[PDB]
């Protein structure tokens, strides 16, 4: 048996308060983790071999 997994981390969620408000806080951290918080372009056309 083999499997593939996405590892985006663990994010604690507190019950009894708004979920969307907590999601916004975690959204910035997720954007920072993926490197998409600041304006950017992708240079991946040179990452190849033959």
């Amino acid at each position: 048996h083999a499997l593939i997994k996405e590892d985006l981390g663990q994010w604690p969620v507190e019950t009894g308060i708004s979920l969307v408000n907590q999601a916004g806080v975690f959204a910035v951290q997720l954007a920072n983790k993926l490197g998409i918080d600041k304006p950017f372009v992708l240079d991946a056309g040179s990452n190849y071999f033959t």
Binding site: G16, I17, S18, N21, V25, A27, V28
Partner: protein, 51 residues
Amino acid sequence: EDMAKIYGAVAAVSKNVNSSVTYEVKRGTHELIKVPTIPHNLVLIQSDNGK
């Protein structure tokens, strides 16, 4: 960074919600005591000759 500060302030006011109150119901209660002896107040008076 500006969005992080805005989202943080909003979450702070959302967390300012009360859950419950806890207290003690003790007014009206008093501590009992125990009396070990019945307070009888009887004496026996008899004459010298017992008549």
